[model samples]
Target: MLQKKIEEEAAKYKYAMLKKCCYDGAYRNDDETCEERAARIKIGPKCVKAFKDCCYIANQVRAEQ
Candidate 1:
């Protein structure tokens, strides 16, 4: 399942970037445009989508596990 896969990846990466970005405001900006926001976020488009999908899966698994 997607949840299982996400859990495995999350265990491997520990969602390091996500945690850092969210808690440390590592990617946040008030002046950056949408295009510039990509670099500011410190992740590529693919990684961003992967991270978001993983997060969704993780949340679901956590609720049920």
Candidate 2:
């Protein structure tokens, strides 16, 4: 239950962040290096740190399930 809830929250967070970052639109426009979306949302540094933290915790949480 706890693990599933964590995963669900993480999934939602990732989806929201990516959507805010314009990942799909940018990919469609083929301007990955431009990072227009990330800039628009103004979450570059904070997003990077949050993503790193999530990844690290995800590994620990999902490890040896």
Candidate 3:
């Protein structure tokens, strides 16, 4: 039961963060970059991780193929 409750909270948190990071009308538009989004929302580690990988030079899967 406790684990289930924790999962719900985590999922809700993720969704809320996604909402903030993602564009939503005038509040958040395509003009904004991921770094700006992270700064505007005052995010944490998980959020940082989401955008940190945007700097990848090449796709690992593509390289392997």
Candidate of highest lDDT? 1
Give the range where candidate 3 is weakest over 10 consecutive residues by summed lDDT: 52-61
Total colliding residue pairs, candidate 2: 0
Backbone clash pairs for candidate 1 read none
lDDT (Cα, tens digit) per residue for candidate 3, span 1-65: 43343244345654776433322211322443545555664565544443333211112223354
Q: Model 1, poorest ten-residue lDDT window?
A: 22-31
Against the correct fold, how does model 3 do in TM-score?
A: 0.29
Q: Is candidate 1 or candidate 3 better by TM-score?
A: 1
Could you tell me the lDDT of residue 52 within candidate 3? 30
lDDT of 1 at 44: 51
Q: How does each model score on TM-score?
A: 0.37, 0.34, 0.29
lDDT of 1 at 22: 31
Say what the RMSD of model 3 is.
9.6
Question: In the order shown, what is each candidate's alpha-carbon RMSD?
Answer: 8.1, 9.5, 9.6
Q: What's the lDDT for candidate 3?
A: 0.38
Question: Taking the tens digit of each residue's C-alpha lDDT, what string does model 2 give over 17-53?
Answer: 7433333322333323333443554556545433334
lDDT at 30 for candidate 3?
40
Tens digits of per-residue lDDT for model 1, 1-65: 64454444445557666443332322222323333443555565445544445545444555576
Candidate 3, residue 51: lDDT: 35
